[model samples]
Target: IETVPVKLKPGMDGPKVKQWPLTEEKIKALVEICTEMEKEGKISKIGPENPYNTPVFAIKKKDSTKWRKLVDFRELNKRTQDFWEVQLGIPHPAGLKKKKSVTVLDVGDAYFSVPLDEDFRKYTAFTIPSINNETPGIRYQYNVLPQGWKGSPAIFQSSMTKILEPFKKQNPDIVIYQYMDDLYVGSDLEIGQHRTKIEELRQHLLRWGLEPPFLWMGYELHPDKWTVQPIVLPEKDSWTVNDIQKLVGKLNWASQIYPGIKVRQLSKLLRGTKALTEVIPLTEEAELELAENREILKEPVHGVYYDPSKDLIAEIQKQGQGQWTYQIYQEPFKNLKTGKYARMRGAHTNDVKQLTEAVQKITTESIVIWGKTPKFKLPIQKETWETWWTEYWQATWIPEWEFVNTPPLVKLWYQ
Candidate 1:
C-alpha cells in the first residue's frame, strides 16, 4: 500500500506543546511503553531540530493492567488537513437481523500498521518527561501513523477498505462491515460456512501485511432480543457537567439500539452549566430518571428489526398539556408461525417538529398512520403538508378514534 503522508493546512507552522505533569507511576509507565514502541520500530528518537513537540501521556487500558501511550495532538490537529473525505461503512444493528451469526476482526496495532511518510514524521514529534534525576527527557516521533492525529481514523479506514475491496468483490455472497480498524463479517449461512469466510478474509488481510490477532471473536446477536449491560452510577450524589456529559454519551449510543430509552431528564439536568468543572447537585427527578434507565437495562429488551415492507406508525401523545412525545412503531402484524404481534423500531422523540419532518422524509413509499389525533394543529404549516402529500401520494394517515389510554410501553418509555 502507498503511504498517505500527513498534510498540514496552508501556511501552518509546527506546533510545540509543553508536557503536562503526571504522577510518578504514570511517568514510569510512559517510559516503559515508549521503549517497547521504539523496539517495535513504531517510533524513533528525533533531534531537537524537529519543530513540532507535542506532550505525550499514558492512559490506563481497559484491563487496568497496561498503559496505552497517547500524544496530545490537539494543538497540531487544529492546523492539519484531512487526508480525504471518507465515510466509514459501519452497519447498523438492525442491518444484522438477516444474519445468523457475526464475528468481529480486530486489526491489532491498527494505526501502526501503516507507515508514516518520512518527510511528515517530524510533525508527530512528542516528548517523554525526564525519568532520570538529572538527564533531560528524550524526544521521539512516530515512524508509522500516530493515534491522536486528526486524520488517522479516516486515513486508516480508507486504507483498510481499499485493502479489502478485492476480497469483497470476489466473495459477493458475504457481507463485510468496516468501521475503522474493526471489520464485522456476518452471513445468513451456517456457522461452518461463516467460519470459512472469516478465515478467508483473515488470509486476504495477511497477504496485505496486516495481522489480525483478535479474529473469531464472536459478536452474539439475538434476532428478537437486545440487552444492555448494567450502568454504573457515580459514587457521589453530586455530579459535574462533565460527569453528566459522559453519561449522556453512553445513553445516546444505547438509545440507537433500544429506541425506547428516554434521555430528556438527563438532558434537562445539563442545562445552564458552562464549564465541565462546574458541579451541580442531582435533582430528585434526575435521580428517578437514572434509576429507571438502570432498571430498564437490566433485562433483555425485544429487538426491533427494520423491515421496509411494513407500514410505519407514528404514535403521538400529549404529556400533560404542553409536552408532546411520539414513538415510531411498525404496524403490528400477527405472525403466522407463532401468532404474536411483530413490533419493530420504536424510536421515541419529544420534539413535535422533528417528528413531523422525519416522518415526511420517509413517507414516500410508506403507509403512515397517526396512532392518535393531535388535539392541536401539527407544528408543520398547511402548505408543507400539502406539498408532502402531493409528492408522496401513497402515504396515508389513519386517525385512531379510540380514547388514548397510556399503554404499558408508553409508560415504560416516559415514566
Candidate 2:
C-alpha cells in the first residue's frame, strides 16, 4: 500500500484557490467524470479538509485530447515539482529515419493505474463542483496517484523506469523512451521488436482498460489528433498582454517536459511592458523567440542535450523587496548529478533543505518497543524546579526513588 506522498515546499501550506469559470457543459462533464470515478472506486468522499484543497477545472478537448476534468494544481505546485527518466537528452527524429517504424504505446489513465497507499491520499483531496444546488459538493481525494500533481510526472516516470530497467538491460538495442505512461519505441527497432518490447514493458506495470492517455509515434505530433496552428514568422500588430500571457503559459507547460526549452527573455519584455493588454508591441526579436517556442512545443518529443562543450544554463527567480520568500528549490539537482545539466528545472531555498532535516529529525524521536503487552504506569511527579536537581542524584544513588514526591505512588517507570 505504498503511495507517493505529496511533497510540498517547506513552510508552504497548500493554497486553496477560487474555482475557474467553467461553462455549463464543462461543469456537467466534470461532475459526470467525478461521479463515474467514485462509482468505480477510483475516488471517494473522504476529507475533513486539507490545505492542499486543489480545485477541479475542465478544458475543451482538442483532437485526441478528450474533454477531461483537471485540477488546478498550480497553487500546490507553486511550492515545488520533477520527472522523467526522460531527462535532457532526446534522440533527434531526423537522424533516425533509416530504421524500422516508431511504435508508441500508452497506458490508459496512466496516472490512476498506479495505486496510492491508503494513508497518502489525504493531501490530494479536491472539491468537485456541486451537482444539485443546495446539498453542496462532497470533497474527495484520489486513491490512485492523480495527474497534474507537481510530483506525479517524476514519481510515475521513476517507478515506471525501475520496472522497465531490468528488461531494458536485457534488450539494450530497443532504445525505449518513456515520458510517464507513454512508452516510445523509437524508429531504430522493427515492428516485431517494438511489439516484443511493449509486451515486456507491460509485465511489470498496470495496464489500463480505458483509452490510453496519449499516443504518438516519432517526434512529430499527429496532424489530426493535435490541433497546432503554425506560427507566422512576423507579428504584424502588437498583441494584448492577455495574448502574451497565454503564449507564456503554453511555453511554460512545454518547458516542463523539455528542459532548457523556454521562450527566452520574454519575461523581461512582460516585466517592462507593464500594461496587461495591447501594452507592448511585438518586436522582430520577440516574434522570433515566440516562433521558436511554438515550433518546439508542437513536437511530441524534444529536449536540449547536456553538453560539456556548451556554457552553463542558469535561471533565478528573485522577488522584489516587498515580496515574502525567494530561492525555493533546486538548481541543486545539478550538484546532485555533477554534469552540465541541459537545464535546471527546479530551485530550492532553506525551505526545501530545512524540511529534509526536519523530517529526518522525526525519526530520532523516542520509540517504545515491547515484546509483550506489559502493564505500565505513567511517571507521576510533583518535583517542580525545586526537587528536579535533588531527584537526579537521589535516583542515581537510590534506584527506587526516581520521583521526589510520591504522587499516585508512581516512579519513573513508563510513558
Candidate 3:
C-alpha cells in the first residue's frame, strides 16, 4: 500500500525508497540459504519481507498486482501510484557489477479490466473458475458484467499463487514469478538449455495442477521473439502471421508487411502510444494489406517440416522484458464447451455444441464440407448437440490415455 503520484521524467525509473536494514545474523542466514540454492542450480527469485524472522508462507510470491478498489479499479488506475512511494523495484547495484545476461520468460497474457456493469456476483459468474472441473485445463475466465469486481484480482491471484505454491522458488540468480499462468522463468541457463529448463519448469507446474502446451520436450526461446496464431477472413484465405516468431520484435514491422497499413494504424486513432495492441476492425486498406502479408509472413515455417510446427512463434525470454509461454489461440477453446466441461457453460452450452458439430462435420477434402455429397455430406445440428456429444466422448475417453489433467497452463487467451 505504499505509493506516490508524480509524473515520470525520461531516464528515471521507480521511486526513491529505503533499503532493508538487516542484522548480521539475518545477513548470515541469507548468505547460507543463497549459497545452498545456487549450489543446487536454482533460479534466483523472491525478495525480502518483514516481521523479524517470523515464519511466513515459504512459497511466498513476488509483489502481487493490486486493484484500486473492490469493484472499480481499472478506469481509476493506481498502477502509477505503487511505483513511487513504495520501494517496489529492488536496487541492483550489485547486479550491475555482475551484469549477467538475464533471460526472462514472460508468462502469457495478463489482464486487469474495468467491467462494463457493476454487479460483483454477476461478474463472478463470468469469471471463469481457476480450473474447469470437467475440462481440467489451465485458464482464468471472468464474466465481464460489472464496472469492476471488488477484490476480484486479489482473490484470483491469491488462489493461483496458493495452487502453484509447490513449484515457486528462488535461486541466487534466477527467479520464477508466477501469477496464475502468467509465468516468467528467468535464469542464466544458456540458449540451448533454455527450453530444457523451461520444460522442467512446466513439469513442475503440471505437478501442481498446471499443464504445458503440447510438444514440451523440443521447445526453444530467446529474447524479443514471439509466435502468434492465424485468423480466418470471410470469403478470403485463412490468414495468419507466418513468422509471429519474428513479428513481435521490430516495432512498425506490421505496417511494413502490410501495404494498406493505414487500416491497422489504430493505436493513434483510438488510443495513442501503441498502434498494434488494439483489435481494430480491418479498414478496407488494412484488410487488403493483412491479406497480402498473410501470404508472405505466414507460409508454413520453413525448415524440416512438422505439421504442428507449421506455425511460427517467437522466442522472447529476457529479465524484466520478455515472454515465453503461450497457448496461441482463441478464448474459451472448443474443448471447454464440448468436452466434460460442457455442463458448466450453462445458457451458452449450445455454443459448444454448434462448434463441435461444425468441427465434426468439417472435412479437409473441401472448404465447405457441408455440401450434399451423399457419403461425405454433413448436416447442420444445434450447437448444444455437438457440445453434449463431444462432452460425452470426452468423459467416456477419460480413462484412456488421450485425456490428461491440465488445470491452469492451458487458456483460450493469453497476454
Candidate 4:
C-alpha cells in the first residue's frame, strides 16, 4: 500500500535519507558489481528501496568499502511484511475444479548454488513468498545464491538465466523464472517437447549452482508422484480492510500446506481478523502470549517466544503417523529442510517497497489452480468472476475479460 521511503541510519540521527546512505566507496563498489551484471545481462539493476528507481550514486569520500552493495537483512526484518501486504501484489488462486488437475510437485531439500545455506545457518531473512535462497547467500560476480551467503537470490536466478540461454535456443517457448520456481509449461500437444525441456532443465540445474528441480527435494526419488494432479490451497486473502470484509470470492483456494505445530503456526499466521478476534485455536500459553501482544505483526518468526507445551508438542509426535495433520505433509514437520516449511525457510524480501519491476518478468498468463480434495479426485471448490454473478449475484453473466459490452457491476435489486 503506502510506504514512506526514507534514508535510515545506524544511529538516531545520522542524516535523513531514502534508503541506505551510499558512500563513495560503496557507490564505486556497487557500480563495479552491477556493471558486470549488466554486461552479462544477469541482472539489469539494483537499488536499496528499489534498484530500478533510486539513483545509487557513489558516496563521495576519500576512502570507502568495496563496491558491492551490502543489504542489511536485520533492518529489513522490521518492515518487509508491512510493505508487501500492501504492494508486491500476490494474486488470488483461481478455480481448481475448472482445471483438469492441480499439480503440486514438492522439491525436497534442494541445496542452492550460492552460500545461502551457510548464512541461513545463523541468520534470519524476510519474505512473504519467503525463500532463503533468493536473497540470503553469497553473490559472487556471477554465481547464484551460495550457501551461507546473502544477496544470492537475484544472482542465483541470473545464473539460472545463463543456463536458460542455450536451453532457450532449442525451446524458446518455455517460460521460466529461476527465482520463484513457479515454472509454467503449458498444456501442449507435443509431449516430446515437454520431455526435452524437462531433461534440459535437469541438466542445466546441475551445471548451474542449484540441484536439479526434479531431484532437489526427493522429487527425483519418487517420479510417479509428480504429475498434473488436483491440489488444495489456502483460502484467498484480500489485502485491504474492505477486501477481506466484503467476502466477495472463493474460500479455501489458496490453502497454506503444513503439518502439526507447523500447520498450527501457518493457520495462526494466515488467520483473518474474523478468525483471530474471537478465540484462537491454541493452548492457554499460546493464546495468552498472542493476546498480550496486540501490536501489528510484520514477520512470521515473531511467534517463537513462548514454547509449545509438552502436551501440544506431543501432538506433533502423533502427527508423524497422520494423527495431527495429513500424512503428506509430515516430512515438512520434522526435517524442516525437506518439506514446504523448508521452502519458506529460504526467505526473500518481505518488502514490496524493496521490490523492482525492472527485472520482473511476467512468465505466464494462465490462472493458478489450487485447493483440491484428497485421492486427488477434483477441486473441492471452484469460483470464478462469472460464477459470482450467476450464483451469488443471481443474474446472467458477462465475461468481462473477453467481452465488456455492459457496464461491470451494474446495480441490481434483490429481495
Please report the candidate that would top lDDT against the real structure. 1
lDDT of each: 0.56, 0.45, 0.28, 0.26
lDDT of predicted model 3: 0.28
Reference-based TM-score of each model: 0.44, 0.42, 0.23, 0.25
Candidate 3 regions off by >4 Å?
A: 1-171, 178-181, 210-415
Q: For candidate 3, lDDT tens digit of each residue in 1-415?
A: 1111233234433222222233344334434543443353321222222111111001101122211111112212222222323333322222211212223222221222222222222112111111223442111112321113223233334444554455454334545442212243445556556556566655654555422222132212222221234322233232223222122222244334333323333222233333333333434554554456556544432232212212221111111112222221112121101111122222243443433322322211011111111111112333433225423221000110011133332221222
Candidate 3 — worst ten consecutive residues by lDDT sum?
Answer: 394-403
lDDT, model 1: 0.56
Rank by lDDT (best first)? 1, 2, 3, 4
Q: What digit string (tens of lDDT, one per residue) describes model 2 on residues 1-415?
A: 3565555557765566755444567677777888888987778887464545776766532234445566656556556533323575333333222335444454435667677656556667787655454456557888886666545555666566666678778877654554323344543554566566656665545442334434321222211121112222234366777767766665665465546556666655676545665567776777777777757645544333333333232111112221111111123222101111111112233222222222211111100010011111112233342223221110000001122233321011100
Query: lDDT tens digits, residues 1-415, model 1?
Result: 4677667889988787877656577678878888888999999998868867887666532223445565667677767874544443332434543456666555535678778877788888887776553567778898887766655656677667787888879877665654333455767767787778778877776777733333334433323232212334455666888888877776775665454667788889878847988887788888888888777666554554545444445444434323344444553321101111112122243233333433432221121111122222233445554334222211112121122333433222331
Which of candidates 1 and 4 is the stronger one according to lDDT?
Answer: 1
Error of 1 at 186 (Å): 4.9
Of 2 and 3, the candidate ranking higher by TM-score: 2
Which segments of model 4 are wrong by more than 4 Å? 1-111, 116-122, 125-152, 178-184, 191-193, 209-415
lDDT at position 407, candidate 4: 29
